[PDB]
Structure formats: structure tokens, C-alpha cells
Write a protein that binds this DNA or RNA. Sequence first.
DNA 1: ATCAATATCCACCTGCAGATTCTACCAAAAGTGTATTTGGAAACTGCTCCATCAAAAGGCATGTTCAGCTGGTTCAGCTGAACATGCCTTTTGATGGAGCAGTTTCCAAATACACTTTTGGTAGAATCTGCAGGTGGATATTGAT
DNA 2: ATCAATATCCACCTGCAGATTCTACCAAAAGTGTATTTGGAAACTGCTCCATCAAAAGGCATGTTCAGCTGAACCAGCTGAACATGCCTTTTGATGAGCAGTTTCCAAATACACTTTTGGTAGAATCTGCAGGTGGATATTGAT
Lengths: 86, 82, 117, 117, 361, 101, 101, 97, 97
Amino acid sequence: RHRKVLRDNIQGITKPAIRRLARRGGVKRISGLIYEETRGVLKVFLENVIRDAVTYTEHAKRKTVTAMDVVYALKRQGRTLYGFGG
Amino acid sequence: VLRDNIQGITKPAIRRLARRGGVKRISGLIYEETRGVLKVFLENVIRDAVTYTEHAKRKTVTAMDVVYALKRQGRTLYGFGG
Amino acid sequence: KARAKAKTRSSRAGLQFPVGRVHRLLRKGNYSERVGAGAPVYLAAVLEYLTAEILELAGNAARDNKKTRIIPRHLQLAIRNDEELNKLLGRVTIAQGGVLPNIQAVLLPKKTESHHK
Amino acid sequence: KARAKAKTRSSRAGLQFPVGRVHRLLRKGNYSERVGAGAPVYLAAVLEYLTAEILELAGNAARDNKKTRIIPRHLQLAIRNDEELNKLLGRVTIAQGGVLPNIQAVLLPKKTESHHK
Amino acid sequence: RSIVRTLHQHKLGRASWPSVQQGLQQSFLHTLDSYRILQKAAPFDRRATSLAWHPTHPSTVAVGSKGGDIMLWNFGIKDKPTFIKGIGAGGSITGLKFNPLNTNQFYASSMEGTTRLQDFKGNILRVFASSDTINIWFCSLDVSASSRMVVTGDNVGNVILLNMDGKELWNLRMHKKKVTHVALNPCCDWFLATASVDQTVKIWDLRQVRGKASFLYSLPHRHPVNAACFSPDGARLLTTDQKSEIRVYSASQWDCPLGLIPHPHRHFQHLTPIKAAWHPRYNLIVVGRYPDPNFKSCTPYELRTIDVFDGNSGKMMCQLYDPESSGISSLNEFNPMGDTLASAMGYHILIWSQEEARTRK
Amino acid sequence: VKKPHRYRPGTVALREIRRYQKSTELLIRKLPFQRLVREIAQDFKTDLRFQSSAVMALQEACEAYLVGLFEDTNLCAIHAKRVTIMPKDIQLARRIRGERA
Amino acid sequence: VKKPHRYRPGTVALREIRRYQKSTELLIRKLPFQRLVREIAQDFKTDLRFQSSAVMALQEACEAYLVGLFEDTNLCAIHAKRVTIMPKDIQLARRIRGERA
Amino acid sequence: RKRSRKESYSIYVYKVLKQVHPDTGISSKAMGIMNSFVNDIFERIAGEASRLAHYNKRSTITSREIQTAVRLLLPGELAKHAVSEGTKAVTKYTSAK
Amino acid sequence: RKRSRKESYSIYVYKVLKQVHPDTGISSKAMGIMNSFVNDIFERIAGEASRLAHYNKRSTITSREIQTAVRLLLPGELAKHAVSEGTKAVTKYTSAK
DNA sequence: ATCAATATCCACCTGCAGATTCTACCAAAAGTGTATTTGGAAACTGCTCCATCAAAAGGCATGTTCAGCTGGTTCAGCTGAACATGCCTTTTGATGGAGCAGTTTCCAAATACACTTTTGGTAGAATCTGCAGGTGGATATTGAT
DNA sequence: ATCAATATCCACCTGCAGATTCTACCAAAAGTGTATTTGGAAACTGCTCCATCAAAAGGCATGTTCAGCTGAACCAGCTGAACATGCCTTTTGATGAGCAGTTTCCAAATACACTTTTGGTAGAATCTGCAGGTGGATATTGAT
């Protein structure tokens, strides 16, 4: 079926999930339009990280995106992630 | 009051730097704050440069020293070698 | 003729970290053509001191929460409540780290209740 | 004894940037134990292309100002007007460069000005 | 287009049998779109694994469950279909086939590692093979009444050949991995085609090949092969791979394939391997569809449907799809008469027959 | 008494803030994030496989980044004499940090 | 001519903005900066000399960083329905970037 | 009398400038900026290539490694043209061994 | 003869933990975090030392180089204590010869 | 009976700081060889990744109420931008000294390399036990009277 | 202000899912013995920087002043918050095959020693944009 839950995409991040993330950050009251911009920013960030990871995996001639690939991709941009290897 | 050489960064000079940055109206208290910010930044850069020159057994803070000091802070500088 | 009993370089320096391992990683890794004798011991000592500081703060945080085991959260609190460590690791994310419970003051309910009509 | 007329590896590749010099700088620098033959050629070509792009944009900037010599100001305009290069050099300060003209709209005054008396 | 004009044109003898067959097949496709209704369905415990048609009876269908349950389901009788409970852990009936002599029995290959002859009433007659050892099981099964031979494959790549009374002279390893399908040709009774996960199909002649895996030919495949089924006339070999490809090989130059039919039937651990089947009295191929995001589908609708192609032209001719059964139809086997189609969806068995003929008084 | 207990606007917001700052459980569900990541992976290469740990790493990093951005945004909102975060706050935060917007 | 030509507030400021954005000569004076740099150096270590190029580099880096901070401060100021830069704006700009130090 | 020999990329930058704009000159300070730019990009690409080599447990920096480094550092359409230019350069060099 | 061997800093971190807090335990994820921390700081200091050796045309990394790297990287009072620990360790090592 | 201080902006002209081009020298780069080494292709294998159908348990998408935030509209008052003045700190020159940043040369601690002996992490089992999840109460929050 | 629904703080009590704690061993570490470099002492030159003098002269510290901005105070209107409830959507346990992760080889590749010669540059002669100085010529923003 053509389910495509509101986009089959970033629109799958339910509004309560963005509310939960904002609350973890200390946000008390949220405007209506914040959700779409949050989805856009998430999409851009994910695109960049995944592009770096996919380049890494393609260089080694692998059909898997290893966790260390994501770790090194994040380290490239300066968001080192501790707890998955180094 | 003691000049402290931080007043050497005159108010008109702060106005000029702010003007080049796109501002139009300066509140009075901006001058002391900008003097403090510049002091902190200069302290950091000079500390790194002095560490570099000390490690080389020198007494002159070379231009390459300050350029390398700026590299660490992520403020790469072009024009004085590299 | 003698072959004195092998004594570890860690014991000589009184460090719990492996001096030989740091030497080996320095040679393999191409940091410089030659590695001096005293560099590995110094580097191992630095690593040991930093690890000790982080673990001490983590254990204090754990005791604060009435837990005997250090889970990833307790490392996050230790790193984020100490200025120098927070600066050394200011651009790092801890798996299952969480955040400090900081809440901005203005958001808190306004207890400044005064004369009202 | 043959001693074929020496042709620079730059000429063989049809490049203006030196290929031997990059190979030397790669060997000395501890970038890796071994450097392949094709690496210096590729790197020299990449550097040449980037230099060509920036210089072409700077020259275009100079012609717009009726100036025939590229001064440091022009390179700033070339880098900070092209989005891709700005991304490449977003964390670099050019000596004696200045800043691009930019005035926020809120600052510009009311536009009411025309002969009315 | 000339729906009725061709049969009379034949009747004068101007048309040969093949043209008549083509016309009758066209009629079959034309009526197939009225079959869309699902006349009956039935549940039982776990995923369905095996489908076998009663060789003679045109309403009896046998289906096995992944847990070792066997169900005899004669449509229209409401006789509380016979059900045999199984272990439920590894009793999966990987292959079910009626005993051609006595239809009340069946040859069932099970994950237990026991290809057995069992009466539908429940009592087990005789076990043909049992390799024991747990990480050795039986996956394939085929029986030829003409020569009274029974063939069964193993998980490692060693196939066995037994008479209907025993005395196997076989167990020579022919593949480096699991042997998925073995098919004994109907027309002849001596040459056998076997498909395996080795990504190769080997054709044998059991009456003449005994010399250390002496094969007539090797059919390379790009991906693992699930099934290698012969046309009822035995002149064509239909081979189904695991990612997306269907190949038909003729008796002439076995090696080269007649046509490559793209079709998405990707593999899954928890899905009964998809098998294309031959239409008993036409040149049609029936196989389910398993949508793929990466597969090339030009149509705007990507639905799970039972596709029907033509053996020679290799083009789609009809599709079956009825919402309320949008599951994946792993298996699809036609009724011997060619009127009813039985499908094995997960946990549901589907029959695509139609109503009867004119009514009496 | 017949009137039903109704919490005033806000007294649940702070409670949620405390609850979700005192915890560490991932907030974005596994399946939607997995689908999103795989969809974005199609544009760069076809027939890619993601280790479960790789997707977990991506989720952790994305949630951390969003939490940081929301903190900076809320800080911007206060500076405007407001309690509600609006899109222009996100845009200013991103502009100051160095990202495109 | 009761009063001389008196430009209204803002116009001279805009003209100065244009003039100092079209130029590239250093805005900080040379000798004061030299003396300040030497004071900081003597704080960190005694009897140190400086190459003229090194002091030039310090001047360039400081001016560039300050102008960047002023751009961000102005961006923050406009956000607050204002045209004036105040210390709170510098504080916010430094905080968002991560320059708390 | 005594003086070292500084090595720079000045002459080659001048050659490229002459190629793209024959009737144009470059100041000494602009030449300094260009030298710094070339050196910085050299260091960036070489470092990323070295990391790519060590990460795959390899000890030789081949053309593939520099290709990946360029793909990773540069943005947008700049990567495409640069990779094409490098590929042409290596193809020409190897075709005339 | 296959035998995987994944080298790690778990045992040493555990020894230090017992030394500084005998009645405390560490989770596997916590131990992974500490492993990553140790590797990260090692890379930082070693790379800074390598860079320093290059600037001064020095072909070796000695205790002075690590000391300068530590002074550059670590902030605040953590630099003083770390350098004091390093000096004490090196003097103890040499005095044992 | 909107033009005037100041600006901007163009047109032209001249000399020199400062780029360009040109001698010469010689340090690296090629070229020709001989020696290591090691990247990618077979080969295998054991962990783990792909993603359906029931079944189920929770979140959540959708609709009311409605409290309170929030842009907007007036309004003081304050305050900083503009301008006029006279001192005065900062630029251009200097002229030496001279401190020491580079540049040679020498050799003795220092480290590499290499083997050969030794034992310390590490991959598996064994088993030990924090604490996650329940179960209950006691208290504080919060709220409309 | 009592009070009246929750939430959160507690506080015992299991049991099991990970952590500690035993092994064997083999790969990496440590101990001698040569080779071979660094780099650091010790002695230079002469280059750059400290100062310290003139003289401006350009900038700034310095007071009026008043025009626009910044902050109050209400205010209406709406929009996010909160609960209520069915209905999705996510979560999860059933007993195949792909491919990441190691071994092991060469043929190809790169490295390592001398040699030849040549682009690289030290610095020196030239050219020559354009910085700077006159002059108009408009042009903008602010006063009837």
C-alpha cells in the first residue's frame, strides 16, 4: 500500500518525539511551526554524516556501513562520539 | 586611574571595528566588555606562542609561532608563511 | 651469563599503564622517525593521571546517587560539573550520556506574587 | 649509456605544479611509510585546479574594479562570494582582506525622499 | 478478437493441434480475470511450507506447516479437514508429495532429517533416510512412479536416491552447499535436474552417471537457485533464482537459457522460498511477486500479486490481486485439471477457483 | 468538586523537563529512524547494509545534536523576552554556530 | 542659517559603515597594540622579543575575531527588536559559539 | 653572502595565473596568501589520506587514498571537477610511461 | 590457527579505579567510554608532539616534546598537575638506572 | 520662492616602490640499476543482517475547552550620536649596538636493530551479586475553594 | 486558609543478566650486543630589534545638545497547553544465507645507492601600475 506515513520520511518522527527532545533540552513552550524546521535540520545533519560514512565504506570496498565508519564520519566534523570504538 | 595599556584600545577604535562589523548603535557598556574579550583572546594566543618559542630554545616570538598558535584555536591565518 | 630477572618498565616508573605499549604505538603510527626513551613513560603517566581524575569524579558522582557501579551517566556528570575536564572534552558526546538537569530560571513558576486586583 | 633527455614528471602529466616536489614533501613528513607514483601527480593536479579556480575568480574581481594587479583584498571577495569555496575556507582569515559589504535591512532608514516643496 | 471464430476454423482440420492449444490458452487467460474471487481459505498454527495436489482428485489439496502439521483439505466437503499435529520446533515439512500408488499416503521431507512415507490417517509406514547429527537435515524431495524412484537432498550437498522399497545406491555429494530442489522428468524417467545454493544447477542421468559426480552439464547461476521444475511434457526446465531472475532451459543445448524473466522474489529467512510452477495443460508459468524498493517496476502500483507469463515469449499476461489477502503468496500450484489455483500465503491457504457449471433441476 | 482536577498550563511542561533531563533513554523510536537513515542512504549508494550498532550510533549523535541546538535556541528565546521557541530562534542559533542557516 | 548643517542621528553612522567596509587598513593603532602584546608576554615570560611580523599577525587575528564577534552581536541585537548592541548580546554570542572558556 | 634557499610555490602560481588571465599580475602579499593556501590544502589532503591509509591497515598512500581525501574535504561540485582533473592527470602520466 | 586479539586499556583502567576507589565497579559500556577517552587523548598528545618535532626540524620525540604537547593541549590546572606527574615519573625511571 | 555640507565619483597626470625579468650557481630531480615488501586475489568461516506475520502493549492523532503570552499601541526619559576644540600620542625618519637567530663543525650519549628468553594480557568458562522491577506506604505539590 | 487528588519520595525483597573472578597460552615485551645516528657544546657572522632622539599631525578627550531609541503599562486576540479516547504503530520471538574478518601468496610496485644534469633560486637591472594630488562633476541628506 501507499502508506507513506505523512511523508514515508522525516515526517515519521512524531510530534511528541520532538516535544520530548525539546523538553530534555529545557524547552518549556513550543511554537507550532518548530516541528518542520526541526525535521529539516535533522535531515541536513543526517545527510552530511551519512555521506561521510558512505564514502568511508566505499573506499574499503564493503557492503556494510560499520559503526567505526559513523564514528570517524562524526569525528571529521568535530562531534566525536565516545562508546562505539576508536 | 592606571592606564593598564588596555585603554590603549581607544573607544573610537572600538567604534571603527564595530562599524566594519555591521552595527549602527553602540551602548555605553560595550567598551569594557570588548576590552575584556580582547584581553582573553590575546592571552590565549600569546600563551600558545610563548609555549612554542620556549620549546625551540629561542627568545623572539617568530611570526610562524603566532600563526601556529592561531591554527590550534581554529583561526588559521594566511599571509605570514605556512 | 646473568640475565637478571625481567622487570617491567611499568614497575620501574611505578605506573599502572603499559609503557611498552605506548612505545609500540608510538613507533607504529608514524609520529616521528625515532622515539626517545623518556617519551613513552611521560605519556603513560599523563594518561594515568587524567584517567584517575575522571574516575575519581565518576565514583564521587556514583556515590552521590547511591550506586556502587559506574554507568555512562555518572561519567557525563563528572565531566560536565568540572570546568577543566569539560573544556578538554567540550566537543565530545557520551553514549547514553544524558545532560545536566540545568533549567533556565525564567521558565520556573513565578513565585513573585504581589498585590493584585 | 643512454641518459634519455630528462623530462619532468610534471611535463609527462601536463601539469604546471611540480610533481617531484609533492612526492618529496610526502616522503618527508611521515604521512605514511610508502608513497605511490600516482599520488603526487593526482595531488599536484588537485592543487593546480584549486589555485586556478581561486585565481580566476580573483582576476574577475580585479577587472570589475579597474585594477590589473591581484591584491589581498580581491582573494577575499573571490572566496567569500562563491559558496563552495566559502565552505572550503570558512575557518580561514585572509591577511588584509576586509569584509564583504553587508548592512542589515533593519538599519537602513525610511526611503521617503523626493522633491515635494 | 476472434474469440469464437478460431475453434470452428480448426474443426475443419485446417488448424494443427498447436494452434488449437494457443487458442485454448488464450481463452484460459481471458477467463482468469474472473477467477479473482477467493472461494475458500483455511487457518492453522504456523507458516505454510508445502503444497501438493491430489494427482487424481480435483478438490483435494495438501498443505504442510512449518511446525510439522499436515492438513488434508478437500474443498466443498466440510469434513473437518484432517489435521496431523507435529512437534512444532523443527518438524517443518520442507516437501510434500502424494504417493502415486496409494493417494492416502504421502512422501514428506521434514527438517527432522527424515523423508518418510506416511498415511494421511497418521501412522508412519517407513522412513527412507535418516542422517541424524542435527546440523544435517533433508530439504528436497521428488518421486517418479514410472521408474519407482525416490530422490531426497541434504543440507550439505549430498543427495540420495531410493527405490519405493529401499536399497539406495546414492549419497554421492554433488554440491558444496544445501541442495534445494530435485526434479525427475515426467516424459523420460532417467535424467534428473537439481538446483542448489551453490549457484549451479546440475543435470544427471541416474541410469548412466555414477563416476564421481559425472554430470551431463553444469548450469551456472549468478545467485542461489531455489527450484528447478520441468514442464509436464518434460521438454523445458524452469529455474527460479533467489534475488530476481527466472530461466527456462530446453532440451536443445541445455546450457544456454531460452529467456531471462525479471521478477522480484528476494529471499528471507522467515519466508517460504518462492517457486514458479508450470501450468499442467498450457505453456503458462505461475509465480508470486515480492516487491522490492530496488527492483525496477514501471507500473505505479507495486502490489503483491501472482503473475502469469508465457513460456516462450517471456512476457506478463495476467495478474491476480484481491485486498484482504495482501500477504506474500510464497507457493502457487495449479489444480491438475487446470481449473483451480491453490496459493500458500503465510498462515493462510488460498484457493482461486470459481463457481460450477449450469445448474440441474 | 464536580469540576475535574485540571493542571494549569505549564505545570506539566516543567515536570516533563525534569523527567527527561533526569533520564537517558533514547527518545526517537528505533524503526522511524532506521527507515529515515536507510532512505537517505539510497541517494548515495544502492544495496547498502547498516549494522545495528551503526544506526544506534547515528541515533545517539542526532539526538545529542538536537538537544544541544534546542538548548541554544531556548537561550535565544529568553534573550528576546519570550518563553516560546519559534523557527527564527533555530535559524539564528544555526547562523551563529556556523551552519548554513 | 540659525543653526549649521546637522546630520541626523544614524546617517553619519551609515556613511562610516560604508567607508570602513570598503577599506582594509588596520583599525587598531600600532604602538598601543605592541605595548599591550608585550605586557601580556612579560606576564607569561620575561625578557621576550617580538618580530614585527608576529605583532602584525596578532593584530590581524584580533581584528578579524573582533569583527566576526561584532557581526554575530548585531545579528543577536536585531533579533531583540532593537538596533543597539548591548553587553548581553556579546554574552549570548560568545555562549552559543562555545567561547565561554 | 650566507643565505638559505627558501622553497615556495610562487613560480607555479604565477604560471597558472598567466594561463587563466595572461594580462594580469599578482602582488607579493597575494602571493603569500596563495602560498599559504596551497600549503594548507596540501596538509589537509595529505593528512586525510594518511588517516584513510592507517584506518584500512594499509601502509602505502596510493591514488585511491588521495581520491577519497579529495571527495571528503571539498564541497559540492568542486569535488567533481577536481577528481576529474586528477583522473586526467594520472591517466596521461601512465599512458606515457 | 586463527586467534583474534583485541588490545584494549580495560585492565589498566580497572586497576586505577580500584586504586582510587576500592569499593566501586565499572560497567562494560563505561569501560568502552574510558577506552575511547584514553585513545583520543593519546592521539591528541602524540600528534601534537609529531607536529612539534616537524617545526623544529627535529627527528625524534623526547620527553620535552611530550611536555610541550601536554602544556599546549590540557587546560588550566590539569596542565600543572599532569606535568608534575610526568616529571616525577621520568625522574623515578631514570633514577632506577 | 527644497537647495548645501559633505560626500562620492570620476577624469587626468606624474614618479617611484616594488613587481618583472635576467644574469649566474648548484641542490634536487631524474635516470639507471638492484632489493625489499606488500596490496589485492583466492580461500574459508563464523558472526550477524535482512526485514513478515501474528500478537500485543503503549503513544498518539484527533478533538474540545481555555489560561496566559504576546504583538500592538501609546507614552516618558535618557542617552548617545553629532559636532567643535586644543592638546598630545603616535607615526615617519634616524643611528647606531648588539643580542642572538642562523650557520658551520665534532663526537659521545642515544636509539635502532636483532636475536633470544620470558611472562602478561586476553579469550573462554564459572560463579557472584547490584539493582530493576515490583510491592507498599508517607509526604510534598498543586490547586479552588 | 482548610483540605483533596495525584506524584515522588522513599523503603524491603527477589533473581538474573551481566561482572568479577579462575585459567593456558602465545605474542609481545625485556635483556644483551653491536651500528649508527642525533643533537647539542662550542665557535662565529651579521640581521633584526630594541631605544630615542624631531617633528608634526592626525586622533582623540573633551563638553553641549537634543532626536530617536529603549524600556514601561494595558490590552485584545489568539494559540499552544492539557485531558479523553479509540486506533494505529511500534516492539518482538519464531531452529538462511551474505559478507566482514583473517591467511597466504606472488607480480607488481616502491625503495634504496650512485650519477648527470637540470630547473630551482641566492641578487641585480630594469619597467611600470597606481598612489597620490588637482580638478571638476555630480549626488546624497538634510534645511521652509
